[PDB]
Amino acid sequence: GTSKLKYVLQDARFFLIKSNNHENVSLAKAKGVWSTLPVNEKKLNLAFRSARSVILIFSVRESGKFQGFARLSSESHHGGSPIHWVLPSAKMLGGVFKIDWICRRELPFTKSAHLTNPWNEHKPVKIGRDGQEIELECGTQLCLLFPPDESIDLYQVIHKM
Ligand SMILES: CC(=O)Nc1cccnc1
């Protein structure tokens, strides 16, 4: 079903995350972490304090697809075990965000072609710089397009809100 998913997404904020390679998204899927440039880290930390759920929607560049989406479970923090990101220097990254995956399945851009993002000139939601915020209605509908991920139990993430 989609009811718990809709509950998690209610009044959420959404951010497009663009990765240059599949290895970084695989690492994020395995370890439940993300790291980004400070301009976006600051935006994500502000959003985390401001909304019940902050959703990151991942897309590997040139892949033609989104690779899933996850919910921020923490503000960024420094001093953890170093994540061996494959970058485009590691000091240039900000802190690390803990994330809880909501869907690890892919969605091709062909399926989201009817969704435009008001915060990026109503261009199709697939188009945007890393860190681009997606307006609430567009972001909710995009997340609802993903195939259900039956390996994830959202009871756990609901208890964090
Ligand atoms: C994990 C990751 O790929 N972070 C990143 C790299 C380059 C630019 N912005 C963010």
Swiss-Prot record:
Its main location: nucleus. RNA binds at residues 18-20, 34-35, 85, 130. Signal peptide: none annotated. Changing residue 92 to A: Reduced binding to N6-methyladenosine (m6A)-containing RNAs. One of its GO terms (biological process) is regulation of alternative mRNA splicing, via spliceosome. Coiled coil: none annotated. GO terms for cellular component: nuclear speck; nucleoplasm; nucleus; plasma membrane. Keywords: Isopeptide bond, mRNA processing, mRNA splicing, Nucleus, Phosphoprotein, RNA-binding, Ubl conjugation. Changing residue 129 to D: Does not affect ability to influence alternative splice site selection. Changing residue 130 to K: Does not affect ability to influence alternative splice site selection. Tyrosine phosphorylated. Changing residue 101 to D: Does not affect ability to influence alternative splice site selection. Changing residue 59 to A: Does not affect ability to influence alternative splice site selection. Changing residue 56 to E: Does not affect ability to influence alternative splice site selection. Changing residue 85 to D: Does not affect ability to influence alternative splice site selection. One of its GO terms (molecular function) is N6-methyladenosine-containing RNA reader activity. Interacts with SRSF1. Interacts with SRSF2. Interacts with SRSF3. Interacts with SRSF7. Interacts with SRSF10. Interacts with CPSF6. Interacts with KHDRBS1/SAM68. Interacts with TRA2B. Interacts with KHDRBS3. Interacts with EMD. Interacts with RBMX. Interacts with ZCCHC8. Regulator of alternative splicing that specifically recognizes and binds N6-methyladenosine (m6A)-containing RNAs. M6A is a modification present at internal sites of mRNAs and some non-coding RNAs and plays a role in the efficiency of mRNA splicing, processing and stability. Acts as a key regulator of exon-inclusion or exon-skipping during alternative splicing via interaction with mRNA splicing factors SRSF3 and SRSF10. The YTH domain mediates RNA-binding. This is YTH domain-containing protein 1. It comes from Homo sapiens (Human). The lineage of its organism: Eukaryota, Metazoa, Chordata, Craniata, Vertebrata. The chain holds residues 345 to 507 of 727 of the full protein.
